[PDB]
Write a protein that binds this ligand. Structure first.
Ligand SMILES: O=C1C=C(N(Cc2ccc(Cl)nc2)CC(F)F)CO1
Ligand SMILES: O=C1C=C(N(Cc2ccc(Cl)nc2)CC(F)F)CO1
Ligand SMILES: O=C1C=C(N(Cc2ccc(Cl)nc2)CC(F)F)CO1
Ligand SMILES: O=C1C=C(N(Cc2ccc(Cl)nc2)CC(F)F)CO1
Ligand SMILES: O=C1C=C(N(Cc2ccc(Cl)nc2)CC(F)F)CO1
Lengths: 198, 200, 198, 201, 197
């Protein structure tokens, strides 16, 4: 098989609107943010403008193929695949995707999507001009799929040396969101960005 | 039936351009705004820039399926469904949808759509820097469907603690709009946002 | 017939790219602006930023149906219909349509489209801070269809009480535009907005 | 034949992705800018924001029809026919088209497209607040078709009377661009906009 | 064959989503930035806004045709072709393409795409107001294709009306590797040494 044959099988098999639930188990989505830049910080409005690479992985085993005598990975446009409907709950601008909208599909049915996103958040900016810094919390989860359909699991080298800001620490913790609006729970990742002005 | 089969049947049955009137009854659309952030307020121009979650529900009974041995809910792209043509009558910017454009369809034909919207309005901003605050009224109804085709019904834990502003009170009241030139009435929800700048 | 049948038949019969000229007569397009807000006025650059509801009507008799025992009006996406190629001749920004892009089609073939438009114009802003006010003229006509293919005819309750400005008077009169290049005449509506700062 | 039939036959015959080269001759494209407004001028960054009507004409004989007993002109969405891939070489913003994206097609195969464009340019703005004014040069030619495939030829009542600026002169001159990465030459029109602030002392 | 026939065959043959790997070779992509303008520089935030023409070439041999008695080049909309998924690793805005999105396809299967791009970057702006200038490094490589699928190989153009002048542009092959991935991503590193006039 060549790349074309692997991509054709994926296009015939993949259902972009259908969550690939195995049995009645949630789809396990891994999310890991790598901060690249902090561009604009407003301590009065408590807003920050950041660039991050959102490493997103999950499994769709119907897409699997025998790669003993074939390429074991291909690039695929996301419009041909199911992709998790992730959103940042405290975003105040739409996510601006800076990179080509291609995913990698691995021969065992693993899918990998790593968009570069520039986006604006409402978060705690107090202490940014201090030694201890500000801690800005970013919450990322499925918008429409509760914990029984999608589970989200989190997993300095990447941060631009040319930022006015410096990263002290990034903490990524599993979490769940619930409102009076809904009987169900929505899993998220809580990303704590502890940073300060240089 | 699996999710694929439910979504396939929805695609065969759904007519995104056709209002799902049951008999000839108006489609009852429930709208409920949850305020998340107030970003920009101008007391001189009487403009506000807000983020809100617009919880929108209605029923389309042709989408119903037997969920005895199937999932009773799926996520569906709104481009596959009829969605009410709601507009904010005092908006001065296009609604910016910040979330994935997916609805939930229940096996009994109930549809739920909850976009996060950032939008700019023309409204009364006087008193925002006072203790009693400003009251900004937002009016949301069907643009093209009068009261015989679409009825609109309204129904702190959501608001960002990091806003410069705080919410004193939110009131959502049914209302109707009618102009002298035309005989038809357009139902809307009137959302009264009573808020102020935090003191400090 | 139900709404679905009327909309299906409209899709089969409507030719969105074909002007619905009856015989060899111009299509009569009726245009009526209702001013909602005046957001920005610049006396030095002679620019204004306005919101208006553009009530637009015309007739396409091929869309007609027997409504004796069916609904006599439906909402239709404008991408399914012919729409007049109207333009504001003194606009300096793209028209931002704020409302759903749906028209109403009546069973006799009358079409109604009322977009909410935010747009910026180059016009006479002198006297805006006086008691008599400024008179800003907006010209709206077909961009590509001369007077033999499209004719344009014009026809307090709407204006926001929260504007910094107030409307003294709005007058809408028929007009025709011609340039030294083109041998043909383009019909327009001339909308005179007499307004002032509060 | 009625308008529907003419538009259907144009859809059948037109190849929007195929340059309509007659023989082995370049397609002769005529371009003529009419300046409507000058919105923003920055003498420090040497940037201008202008609105202009770009009268664009060419011929595509495979669109032709017998108009002895039918309309001799129709309006056509530009997505339905071939349009020249014109670009402004010194643009620093995308062209914002303000008007309906319709061309006029004549029964002899002549095509006319006149978008209203708002766009920002990098050009010489020095002298705008002087009596002799600034001369801002705008260069418009095919982006991908050299002089053997596309030739470009250029051809007061249009300019807004309400502008802060006044136009002293507009000159439109044929020209050719070449680079050392290319054996071929790209034809352009060079538009010299000589303008200044009104009401100086 | 006329232009219509060549374009029709390209439309039938082209696979926009399939990297045109010949044999087991990485696709050799040649990238060359021509700087046209420097519009906005902020020495405090270390941001620049630039216009550049990105001359990009590669080969797709399935597109080849016999041009002995036909045109040997046509213009093709990029949406009909495979195009390398290049990204600027230090970009802080989307690339704004200012030009018609057309590639040239040559009868031997060579593809040429030269978009005009306006884009904002995070880079070293210190020294811009000095005689030796700032050196702003831009890194451009495949986002999703490692070195075994895509290989990247690198005055007349610059606007005389910029507030800035270019002292030197150096374009050097490079490779990017993270703990994130076992794989290496080839890039071009473009060093723009410029200063205020
Ligand atoms: O986690 C990551 C992977 C990164 N890259 C490779 C990559 C791998 C797979 C996908 Cl679907 N998309 C991209 C970009 C490289 F140039 F750095 C960056 O951050
Ligand atoms: O009413 C609500 C439901 C909200 N969400 C879940 C949800 C459920 C169904 C749909 Cl169609 N869309 C979204 C977001 C969650 F992350 F909180 C927000 O407020
Ligand atoms: O003339 C008018 C009719 C208005 N509306 C109803 C309407 C009717 C028909 C169409 Cl095609 N579009 C809209 C909006 C309503 F909320 F008022 C506004 O101004
Ligand atoms: O040269 C011109 C032609 C202009 N118009 C007529 C026109 C005719 C054909 C086409 Cl394809 N596009 C436009 C607009 C009218 F309002 F004047 C303006 O400037
Ligand atoms: O390298 C280059 C080629 C340039 N042009 C010609 C061209 C050739 C091929 C392609 Cl696919 N796209 C464009 C633009 C011309 F107007 F100069 C400029 O920079």
């Amino acid at each position: 098989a060549d790349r074309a044959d692997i991509l054709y099988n994926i296009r015939q098999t993949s259902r972009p609107d259908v969550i690939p639930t195995q049995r009645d188990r949630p789809v396990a989505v891994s999310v890991s943010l790598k901060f690249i830049n902090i561009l604009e910080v407003n301590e009065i409005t408590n807003e920050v403008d950041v660039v991050f690479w959102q490493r997103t992985t999950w499994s769709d085993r119907t897409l699997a193929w025998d790669s003993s005598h074939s390429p074991d990975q291909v690039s695929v446009p996301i419009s041909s695949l199911w992709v998790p409907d992730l959103a940042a709950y405290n975003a105040i601008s739409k996510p601006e995707v800076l990179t080509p909208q291609l995913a990698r599909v691995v021969s065992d049915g693993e899918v990998l999507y790593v968009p570069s996103i520039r986006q604006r958040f409402s978060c705690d900016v107090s202490g940014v001009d201090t030694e201890s810094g500000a801690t800005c919390r970013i919450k990322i989860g499925s918008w429409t799929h509760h914990s029984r359909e999608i589970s989200v699991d989190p997993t300095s080298e990447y941060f631009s040396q040319y930022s006015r800001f410096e990263i002290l620490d990034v903490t990524q913790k599993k979490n769940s969101v619930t409102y009076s609006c809904c009987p169900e729970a929505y899993e998220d990742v809580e990303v704590s960005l502890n940073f300060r002005k240089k």
